[PDB]
Short mmCIF file of C-alpha atoms in Angstrom, two decimals:
data_model
loop_
_atom_site.label_atom_id
_atom_site.label_comp_id
_atom_site.label_asym_id
_atom_site.label_seq_id
_atom_site.Cartn_x
_atom_site.Cartn_y
_atom_site.Cartn_z
CA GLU A 3 -55.28 74.67 -43.76
CA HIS A 4 -56.09 71.39 -41.89
CA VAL A 5 -59.92 70.95 -40.90
CA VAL A 6 -61.05 68.66 -38.22
CA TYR A 7 -64.83 67.66 -38.72
CA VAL A 8 -66.31 66.68 -35.16
CA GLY A 9 -69.59 64.44 -34.78
CA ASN A 10 -70.90 61.10 -32.86
CA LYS A 11 -67.86 58.97 -32.86
CA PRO A 12 -66.01 59.05 -29.57
CA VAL A 13 -64.26 62.25 -28.45
CA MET A 14 -60.34 59.71 -28.62
CA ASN A 15 -60.97 59.64 -32.44
CA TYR A 16 -61.43 63.45 -33.02
CA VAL A 17 -58.51 64.12 -30.44
CA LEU A 18 -56.14 61.86 -32.50
CA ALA A 19 -56.92 63.25 -36.05
CA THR A 20 -56.30 66.73 -34.53
CA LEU A 21 -52.95 65.76 -32.72
CA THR A 22 -52.35 63.57 -35.93
CA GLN A 23 -52.08 67.06 -38.14
CA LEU A 24 -50.24 68.69 -35.85
CA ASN A 25 -47.03 65.62 -35.25
CA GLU A 26 -47.62 65.83 -38.96
CA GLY A 27 -46.72 69.13 -40.41
CA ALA A 28 -50.08 71.53 -38.94
CA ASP A 29 -48.62 74.61 -37.52
CA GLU A 30 -52.73 75.47 -37.05
CA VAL A 31 -55.99 73.19 -37.12
CA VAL A 32 -59.65 74.07 -37.04
CA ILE A 33 -62.35 71.76 -35.42
CA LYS A 34 -65.23 72.52 -36.89
CA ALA A 35 -68.65 71.03 -35.82
CA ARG A 36 -72.55 71.80 -35.98
CA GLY A 37 -75.41 71.57 -33.24
CA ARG A 38 -74.83 69.05 -31.13
CA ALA A 39 -71.42 68.00 -32.17
CA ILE A 40 -70.20 71.74 -30.03
CA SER A 41 -69.68 69.82 -26.81
CA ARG A 42 -67.53 67.35 -28.75
CA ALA A 43 -66.29 69.92 -30.47
CA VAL A 44 -64.57 71.90 -27.52
CA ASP A 45 -64.54 68.37 -25.39
CA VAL A 46 -62.02 68.15 -28.43
CA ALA A 47 -60.24 71.54 -28.07
CA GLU A 48 -59.59 71.18 -24.38
CA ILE A 49 -58.09 67.16 -24.11
CA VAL A 50 -55.38 68.12 -26.95
CA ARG A 51 -54.52 71.30 -24.95
CA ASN A 52 -54.68 69.61 -21.55
CA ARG A 53 -53.31 66.15 -21.14
CA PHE A 54 -51.96 65.64 -24.59
CA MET A 55 -50.42 68.33 -25.56
CA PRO A 56 -49.67 72.17 -23.63
CA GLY A 57 -48.74 74.52 -24.90
CA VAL A 58 -50.65 74.32 -28.04
CA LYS A 59 -53.46 77.69 -28.05
CA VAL A 60 -57.29 78.50 -28.73
CA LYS A 61 -56.25 81.08 -31.45
CA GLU A 62 -59.98 81.98 -32.08
CA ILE A 63 -63.33 80.90 -31.99
CA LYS A 64 -66.07 81.99 -34.76
CA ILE A 65 -70.11 80.35 -34.34
CA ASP A 66 -72.79 80.83 -36.39
CA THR A 67 -75.90 79.33 -38.15
CA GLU A 68 -75.98 77.64 -41.57
CA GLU A 69 -79.16 76.70 -43.48
CA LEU A 70 -79.58 73.03 -43.38
CA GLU A 71 -80.92 72.04 -47.10
CA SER A 72 -84.58 72.05 -47.07
CA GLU A 73 -86.13 68.29 -45.94
CA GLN A 74 -89.90 67.71 -46.79
CA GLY A 75 -90.08 71.75 -47.65
CA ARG A 76 -88.21 73.18 -44.83
CA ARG A 77 -84.52 74.48 -44.03
CA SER A 78 -83.65 74.18 -40.61
CA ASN A 79 -80.90 75.85 -38.86
CA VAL A 80 -78.20 74.75 -37.24
CA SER A 81 -75.27 76.24 -34.85
CA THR A 82 -72.29 75.59 -35.97
CA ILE A 83 -68.36 76.15 -34.21
CA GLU A 84 -65.12 76.67 -35.93
CA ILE A 85 -62.04 76.50 -33.35
CA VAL A 86 -58.75 77.02 -34.43
CA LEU A 87 -55.81 75.20 -32.19
CA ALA A 88 -52.41 76.75 -32.72
CA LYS A 89 -48.83 75.28 -31.66
CA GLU B 3 -71.90 91.54 -15.90
CA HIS B 4 -75.26 89.96 -15.76
CA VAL B 5 -74.93 85.95 -17.07
CA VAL B 6 -77.10 83.53 -17.49
CA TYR B 7 -76.57 79.65 -17.24
CA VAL B 8 -77.95 77.76 -20.09
CA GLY B 9 -78.92 73.92 -18.66
CA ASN B 10 -81.60 71.77 -20.11
CA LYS B 11 -84.58 73.37 -19.84
CA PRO B 12 -85.74 74.36 -23.66
CA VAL B 13 -84.06 76.61 -25.77
CA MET B 14 -86.46 79.58 -25.87
CA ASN B 15 -86.14 80.19 -22.06
CA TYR B 16 -82.61 80.82 -22.15
CA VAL B 17 -83.37 83.14 -25.20
CA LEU B 18 -85.25 85.26 -22.83
CA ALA B 19 -83.35 84.86 -20.08
CA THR B 20 -80.81 86.44 -22.18
CA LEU B 21 -83.60 89.12 -24.02
CA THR B 22 -85.09 90.44 -20.38
CA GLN B 23 -81.44 91.25 -19.34
CA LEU B 24 -80.56 93.23 -22.69
CA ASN B 25 -83.84 95.12 -22.07
CA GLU B 26 -83.82 96.00 -18.39
CA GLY B 27 -80.30 97.83 -18.72
CA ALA B 28 -77.97 95.37 -19.79
CA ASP B 29 -75.21 96.39 -22.40
CA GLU B 30 -73.84 92.76 -22.32
CA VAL B 31 -74.36 89.73 -21.22
CA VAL B 32 -72.76 86.69 -20.51
CA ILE B 33 -74.21 82.94 -21.99
CA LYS B 34 -72.19 80.00 -19.67
CA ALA B 35 -72.43 76.14 -20.21
CA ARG B 36 -71.03 73.02 -19.86
CA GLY B 37 -70.80 70.46 -20.96
CA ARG B 38 -74.05 68.98 -23.50
CA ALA B 39 -75.60 72.31 -22.60
CA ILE B 40 -72.92 74.08 -24.80
CA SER B 41 -74.03 73.23 -27.67
CA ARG B 42 -77.60 74.53 -26.67
CA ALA B 43 -75.72 77.66 -25.02
CA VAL B 44 -74.78 78.62 -29.06
CA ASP B 45 -77.90 78.36 -30.06
CA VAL B 46 -79.46 80.93 -27.75
CA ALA B 47 -76.34 83.49 -28.48
CA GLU B 48 -77.11 82.77 -32.34
CA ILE B 49 -81.24 82.84 -31.76
CA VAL B 50 -80.67 86.65 -29.94
CA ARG B 51 -78.72 88.02 -32.44
CA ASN B 52 -79.80 86.17 -35.84
CA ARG B 53 -83.75 86.90 -35.36
CA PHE B 54 -84.74 88.60 -31.82
CA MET B 55 -81.54 91.39 -32.05
CA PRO B 56 -79.85 92.00 -34.63
CA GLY B 57 -77.20 94.41 -34.13
CA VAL B 58 -76.20 92.66 -31.26
CA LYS B 59 -72.39 91.29 -32.18
CA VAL B 60 -71.00 87.70 -30.36
CA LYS B 61 -67.67 90.25 -28.27
CA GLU B 62 -66.02 86.41 -27.08
CA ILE B 63 -65.77 83.37 -26.45
CA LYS B 64 -63.71 81.60 -24.09
CA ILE B 65 -63.52 77.76 -23.66
CA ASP B 66 -61.95 75.87 -21.04
CA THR B 67 -62.14 72.85 -18.17
CA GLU B 68 -63.82 72.84 -15.00
CA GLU B 69 -62.80 70.11 -12.85
CA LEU B 70 -65.82 69.41 -11.25
CA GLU B 71 -66.40 67.66 -6.99
CA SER B 72 -65.43 64.29 -6.94
CA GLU B 73 -67.95 62.06 -5.98
CA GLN B 74 -67.29 58.46 -5.90
CA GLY B 75 -63.73 59.04 -5.14
CA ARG B 76 -63.49 60.42 -8.71
CA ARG B 77 -63.55 64.31 -10.01
CA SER B 78 -64.02 64.59 -13.21
CA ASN B 79 -63.51 66.99 -16.29
CA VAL B 80 -66.20 69.04 -18.26
CA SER B 81 -66.23 71.31 -20.80
CA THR B 82 -67.11 74.82 -20.60
CA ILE B 83 -67.70 78.03 -22.71
CA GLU B 84 -68.77 81.64 -21.45
CA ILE B 85 -70.64 83.32 -24.44
CA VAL B 86 -70.21 87.58 -24.15
CA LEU B 87 -72.99 88.99 -26.15
CA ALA B 88 -72.96 92.82 -26.28
CA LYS B 89 -75.66 95.41 -27.77
CA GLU C 3 -55.01 43.96 -42.16
CA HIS C 4 -53.70 47.16 -41.26
CA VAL C 5 -49.93 47.74 -41.30
CA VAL C 6 -47.87 50.25 -39.95
CA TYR C 7 -44.42 50.62 -41.67
CA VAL C 8 -41.93 52.38 -38.34
CA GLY C 9 -39.08 55.40 -39.87
CA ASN C 10 -36.97 57.49 -38.46
CA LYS C 11 -39.68 60.40 -37.52
CA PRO C 12 -40.43 61.22 -33.79
CA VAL C 13 -41.64 57.60 -32.24
CA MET C 14 -45.12 59.85 -31.61
CA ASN C 15 -46.31 59.70 -35.23
CA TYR C 16 -46.51 56.34 -35.52
CA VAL C 17 -47.92 55.90 -31.87
CA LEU C 18 -50.82 57.96 -32.75
CA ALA C 19 -50.73 56.50 -36.67
CA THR C 20 -51.23 52.93 -34.79
CA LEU C 21 -54.10 53.97 -32.25
CA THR C 22 -56.02 55.74 -34.89
CA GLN C 23 -55.91 52.00 -36.69
CA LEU C 24 -57.44 50.50 -33.60
CA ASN C 25 -60.25 53.35 -33.26
CA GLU C 26 -61.57 53.46 -36.37
CA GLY C 27 -62.41 50.16 -36.77
CA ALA C 28 -59.67 47.31 -36.55
CA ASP C 29 -59.27 44.96 -34.17
CA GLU C 30 -55.14 44.10 -35.00
CA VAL C 31 -52.21 46.57 -36.57
CA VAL C 32 -49.17 45.27 -37.41
CA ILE C 33 -46.37 47.46 -36.92
CA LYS C 34 -43.18 46.97 -39.29
CA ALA C 35 -39.79 48.10 -39.69
CA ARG C 36 -36.12 47.60 -41.59
CA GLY C 37 -33.01 47.86 -39.93
CA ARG C 38 -32.35 50.66 -37.19
CA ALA C 39 -36.17 51.77 -37.02
CA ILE C 40 -36.61 48.02 -35.67
CA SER C 41 -36.12 49.18 -32.43
CA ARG C 42 -38.34 52.28 -32.78
CA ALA C 43 -41.10 50.22 -34.28
CA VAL C 44 -40.82 47.91 -30.32
CA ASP C 45 -41.15 51.64 -28.39
CA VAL C 46 -44.89 51.87 -30.60
CA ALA C 47 -45.42 48.83 -29.71
CA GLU C 48 -44.68 49.37 -26.37
CA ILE C 49 -46.15 52.62 -25.24
CA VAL C 50 -49.42 51.84 -27.40
CA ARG C 51 -50.27 49.35 -24.87
CA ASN C 52 -48.85 50.54 -22.09
CA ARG C 53 -50.15 54.15 -21.57
CA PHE C 54 -52.38 54.89 -23.77
CA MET C 55 -53.83 51.74 -24.75
CA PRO C 56 -53.49 48.74 -22.18
CA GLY C 57 -55.74 45.60 -22.67
CA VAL C 58 -54.18 45.21 -26.25
CA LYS C 59 -51.89 42.65 -25.98
CA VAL C 60 -48.53 41.34 -28.52
CA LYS C 61 -50.12 38.64 -30.86
CA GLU C 62 -46.97 37.76 -32.81
CA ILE C 63 -43.52 38.85 -32.99
CA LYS C 64 -42.09 37.98 -36.62
CA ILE C 65 -37.77 38.89 -37.69
CA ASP C 66 -36.52 38.33 -40.69
CA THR C 67 -34.31 39.63 -43.35
CA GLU C 68 -35.18 40.99 -46.71
CA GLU C 69 -32.71 41.28 -49.44
CA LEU C 70 -32.82 45.36 -50.85
CA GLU C 71 -31.97 46.38 -54.43
CA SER C 72 -28.63 46.30 -55.70
CA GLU C 73 -26.67 49.26 -55.24
CA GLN C 74 -23.38 49.81 -56.74
CA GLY C 75 -23.30 46.19 -57.91
CA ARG C 76 -24.06 44.92 -54.65
CA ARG C 77 -27.15 43.59 -52.87
CA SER C 78 -27.66 44.67 -49.20
CA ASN C 79 -29.58 42.37 -46.20
CA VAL C 80 -31.72 44.15 -43.52
CA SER C 81 -33.45 42.88 -40.44
CA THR C 82 -37.08 43.22 -40.59
CA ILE C 83 -39.19 42.35 -37.19
CA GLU C 84 -43.13 42.47 -37.80
CA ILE C 85 -45.66 42.86 -34.44
CA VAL C 86 -49.16 42.28 -34.49
CA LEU C 87 -50.47 44.16 -31.58
CA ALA C 88 -54.15 43.08 -31.36
CA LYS C 89 -57.56 44.42 -29.21
CA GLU D 3 -29.64 28.99 -19.31
CA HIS D 4 -27.75 30.98 -21.38
CA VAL D 5 -27.82 34.68 -22.06
CA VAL D 6 -26.15 37.35 -24.60
CA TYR D 7 -26.20 40.75 -23.95
CA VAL D 8 -25.96 42.77 -26.92
CA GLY D 9 -25.01 46.92 -26.52
CA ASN D 10 -23.31 48.95 -29.06
CA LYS D 11 -20.06 47.07 -29.51
CA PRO D 12 -19.98 45.70 -33.52
CA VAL D 13 -22.36 42.51 -34.30
CA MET D 14 -19.76 40.41 -34.63
CA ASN D 15 -18.74 39.76 -31.22
CA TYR D 16 -22.64 39.47 -30.52
CA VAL D 17 -22.22 36.88 -32.97
CA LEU D 18 -19.70 34.79 -32.13
CA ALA D 19 -20.78 34.77 -28.41
CA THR D 20 -23.88 33.96 -29.75
CA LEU D 21 -21.84 30.83 -31.98
CA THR D 22 -20.14 29.98 -28.98
CA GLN D 23 -22.88 29.27 -26.38
CA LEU D 24 -24.12 26.64 -29.22
CA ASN D 25 -21.33 25.70 -30.11
CA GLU D 26 -19.98 25.00 -25.71
CA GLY D 27 -23.24 22.75 -24.53
CA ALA D 28 -26.06 24.95 -25.13
CA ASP D 29 -29.01 24.05 -27.17
CA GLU D 30 -30.75 27.16 -26.63
CA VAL D 31 -28.98 30.62 -26.19
CA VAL D 32 -31.08 34.08 -26.03
CA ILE D 33 -30.50 37.31 -27.18
CA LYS D 34 -30.64 40.58 -24.99
CA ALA D 35 -30.95 43.51 -25.75
CA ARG D 36 -32.35 47.20 -24.98
CA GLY D 37 -33.50 50.37 -26.48
CA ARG D 38 -31.72 51.24 -29.89
CA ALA D 39 -29.71 48.04 -29.12
CA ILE D 40 -33.30 46.16 -29.89
CA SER D 41 -32.31 46.40 -33.75
CA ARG D 42 -28.48 45.35 -33.28
CA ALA D 43 -29.49 42.34 -31.46
CA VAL D 44 -32.16 41.24 -33.91
CA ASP D 45 -29.31 41.31 -36.81
CA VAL D 46 -27.13 39.23 -34.10
CA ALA D 47 -30.07 36.61 -34.44
CA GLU D 48 -30.46 36.85 -38.19
CA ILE D 49 -26.56 36.67 -38.64
CA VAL D 50 -25.85 33.45 -36.90
CA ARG D 51 -29.46 31.05 -38.23
CA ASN D 52 -29.31 32.74 -41.93
CA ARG D 53 -25.06 32.21 -42.68
CA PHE D 54 -23.50 30.48 -39.91
CA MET D 55 -26.21 27.85 -37.90
CA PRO D 56 -29.14 27.27 -40.36
CA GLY D 57 -30.96 25.00 -38.52
CA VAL D 58 -31.10 27.57 -35.63
CA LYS D 59 -34.42 28.19 -35.20
CA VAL D 60 -36.19 31.17 -33.52
CA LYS D 61 -37.82 30.00 -30.15
CA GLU D 62 -39.61 33.37 -28.71
CA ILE D 63 -39.59 36.25 -29.32
CA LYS D 64 -40.79 38.84 -26.17
CA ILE D 65 -40.49 42.54 -26.01
CA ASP D 66 -40.94 43.95 -23.22
CA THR D 67 -40.83 47.31 -20.82
CA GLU D 68 -37.89 48.32 -17.96
CA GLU D 69 -37.68 50.94 -16.07
CA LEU D 70 -34.10 52.38 -15.09
CA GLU D 71 -32.59 53.90 -12.13
CA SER D 72 -33.97 57.50 -11.81
CA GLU D 73 -31.37 60.23 -12.68
CA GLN D 74 -31.64 63.56 -11.87
CA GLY D 75 -35.23 62.67 -10.75
CA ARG D 76 -36.90 60.91 -12.96
CA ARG D 77 -36.92 57.11 -14.10
CA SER D 78 -36.82 56.67 -17.50
CA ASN D 79 -38.54 53.62 -19.90
CA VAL D 80 -36.57 51.66 -22.21
CA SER D 81 -37.75 49.26 -24.53
CA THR D 82 -36.48 45.42 -24.83
CA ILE D 83 -36.53 42.61 -26.84
CA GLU D 84 -35.40 39.09 -25.80
CA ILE D 85 -35.04 36.06 -28.67
CA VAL D 86 -34.47 32.71 -27.99
CA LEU D 87 -32.77 30.87 -30.26
CA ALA D 88 -32.73 26.90 -30.38
CA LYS D 89 -30.47 24.26 -32.39
#
C-alpha cells in the first residue's frame, strides 16, 4: 500500500499524486489527512473519481482521533480520515 | 431518521444537537456537511463517541459531490460527507 | 531544471509527471525522448498545454542525434527531441 | 515554400524528396508529419543535415495539434510537427 497525505497545498497537487500512484502500478491508494485538511482529502477523492478516473471506487472510509505530541504541557486531539480508493 | 447538518457554528453546538437526538429516542443519527464543514462534521462524530457517549459506533460514512445552484452563470461542485452514528 | 524522459509507457504517465513538476515549484520543464518515443513526447507536450494547463508555452524545441553504445560491433544513431515547456 | 510530408514509407524516400527540393532551387524546405510519423520526420531532418548536406540548418520547429475529421461521431486529435531546414 500506497498512501497520500493531504495537507494545505493546492488540491491539484494531491490529485496528481493520487493519479500518479494509480497509474504507476497501484490497484489501491489511501488518502489520509487530519484536522481541517480532512475537507481537502474528500475533495481529492471526489476529483479523482469524478473527472479523472471514473471507475475508481471508494472502498472504505475510516475516521478516528489522534493524540498529538504535547505542546506547552497539553496533548491536543485532532480528527483524522482515511479514504481508500480502488481501481 | 434524524439528521444534523454541520455548519460554521462552534463544534459544541452540533455535538449537543447530536447528543440531544440520541437522548431523545433516536437509535441512529446522521451527521452531514459540505465543503470545509466536513472537517467539523468528523470532529462532531469523534467528540460524541469519544468523550460523551462511548459505545456509540460509526455505522457508515459516505462521501459525494453536490452540484450547487448556479451563481453568475456557473454551477459549482462541493464535497459532502454523511456520517451515521449508531447506539 | 526538471527533466521528463518519455518512453513507451502510456502517455498519461508522462503528462502527470510533467504536471507534477509544474505544480511542485518548477517554472519550466524539459520533455526529452529518442527514436519512436519522440512522437509520444510531442503528445505529452500538447496534452499538458492543451487540456491540463493552458497558458504553459513551448519555449524551445531542439532535435539532434545521439550515437548509442555499440552492440555487436556497431554504434547506432538515434534521433532525439527536447521540448521546453514554460509557465 | 516547399513542403515534404512524412508518412510511413521508408525514411530514405523522404530524405531524397527533401534533398531533391534543396538541389532543385529551394533555399528552405519544411518537413511535416503527424502522429507517429513525427519520429520519422525528425529522422529525415537529421539524416539530411548529418550525412547528406552538412551546412543545412534547422531554422525552426513547431508542434501543434490537429483536429481530424470525425469518424463514427468523434473528432480525434493528432499531434503535428513542422521542421524548417535552411541552406
